[PDB]
Amino acid sequence: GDTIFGKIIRKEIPAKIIFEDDRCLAFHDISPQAPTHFLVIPKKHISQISVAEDDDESLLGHLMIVGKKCAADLGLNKGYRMVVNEGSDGGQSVYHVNLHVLGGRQMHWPPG
Amino acid sequence: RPGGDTIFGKIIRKEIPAKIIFEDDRCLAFHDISPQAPTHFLVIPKKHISQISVAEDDDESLLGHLMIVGKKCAADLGLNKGYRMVVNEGSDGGQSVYHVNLHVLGGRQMHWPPG
Ligand SMILES: COC(=O)[C@@H](C)NP(=O)(O)OC[C@H]1O[C@@H](n2cnc3c(N)ncnc32)[C@H](O)[C@@H]1O
Ligand SMILES: [Cl-]
């Protein structure tokens, strides 16, 4: 089923967009957990990483490359953390695959 | 040397021990020595890349493969309630081994924020 991230891709509700191409969208998280906290999502509706297909490998890697490029553009020269959450135990909040990128502060261990 | 001389390069070449879950021509999945969850493993490329910030555009398929292998290993390990994947960059990310590594953590409720 559709999610709020689908609405964001479709431009039906606003988001602070950082980057877009034909296959993904990066935008600041509405509930940021670090001074910089953004998401990179595919335009293809993959509901969760556990159901991603082998043919999705380059698209998933594209999310990470876009994420690291956006992190550099946003000035995260001291580092950052990338996160993908799966399911209940993973704390996944939206059933549309989304890569979190967090920085601008020390990230701690364990990662939740 | 193929894989570099970080401890992960040593693990790739079987020069120091590891508890391996899965291995192919592109990557290796093995359990973390300091687990932060009941199940906590790493997926690393066999190609040495020091950190995600220096990955090349042509590394997209390899990076995605780490995630596909991670999710397949999580299923094979029975993490049916979910899990969290983590890649750390540099000092603020907490990176400690400069060879790209994807963490997969599960078997308990993970909390927010993720550190
Ligand atoms: C502060 O460092 C960290 O915990 C994370 C955040 N940094 P990191 O660079 O993201 O993760 C490196 C991980 O590599 C694991 N490790 C280190 N030596 C071995 C080994 N010989 N076999 C298996 N796992 C090993 C550590 O316990 C870390 O969790
Ligand atoms: Cl999420």
From Swiss-Prot, chain B:
Gene Ontology CC terms: cytoplasm; cytoskeleton; cytosol; extracellular exosome; histone deacetylase complex; nucleoplasm; nucleus; plasma membrane
Modified residues (N6-acetyllysine): 10, 19
Domain HIT: from-to ranges: 7-115
Subcellular localization(s) per the UniProt record: Cytoplasm; Nucleus
Residues involved in AMP binding: 32-33, 88, 94-96, 101-103
Effect noted on mutating residue 86 to D: Loss of dimerization. Strongly reduced adenosine 5'-monophosphoramidase activity. A 110-fold increased affinity for 3-indolepropionic acyl-adenylate and a 100-fold increased affinity for tryptamine adenosine phosphoramidate monoester
UniProt note on tissues of expression: Widely expressed.
Catalytic-site annotation from UniProt: 101 (tele-amp-histidine intermediate)
Major subcellular site: cytoplasm
Catalytic reactions on record: adenosine 5'-phosphoramidate + H2O = AMP + NH4(+)
EC assignment: 3.9.1.-, 3.4.22.-
Associated disease: Neuromyotonia and axonal neuropathy, autosomal recessive: An autosomal recessive neurologic disorder characterized by onset in the first or second decade of a peripheral axonal neuropathy predominantly affecting motor more than sensory nerves. The axonal neuropathy is reminiscent of Charcot-Marie-Tooth disease type 2 and distal hereditary motor neuropathy. Individuals with NMAN also have delayed muscle relaxation and action myotonia associated with neuromyotonic discharges on needle EMG resulting from hyperexcitability of the peripheral nerves.
Function: Exhibits adenosine 5'-monophosphoramidase activity, hydrolyzing purine nucleotide phosphoramidates with a single phosphate group such as adenosine 5'monophosphoramidate (AMP-NH2) to yield AMP and NH2. Hydrolyzes adenosine 5'monophosphomorpholidate (AMP-morpholidate) and guanosine 5'monophosphomorpholidate (GMP-morpholidate). Hydrolyzes lysyl-AMP (AMP-N-epsilon-(N-alpha-acetyl lysine methyl ester)) generated by lysine tRNA ligase, as well as Met-AMP, His-AMP and Asp-AMP, lysyl-GMP (GMP-N-epsilon-(N-alpha-acetyl lysine methyl ester)) and AMP-N-alanine methyl ester.
Subunit annotation: Homodimer. Interacts with CDK7. Interacts with RUVBL1 and RUVBL2 and is associated with the LEF1/TCF1-CTNNB1 complex and with a KAT5 histone acetyltransferase complex. Identified in a complex with MITF and CTNNB1. Interacts with CDC34 and RBX1, and is part of a SCF (SKP2-CUL1-F-box protein) E3 ubiquitin-protein ligase complex. Interacts with SUMO1, SUMO2 and RGS17. Interacts with the Ten-1 ICD form of TENM1. Interacts with CALM1; interaction increases in the presence of calcium ions.
Name used for this protein in its record: Adenosine 5'-monophosphoramidase HINT1
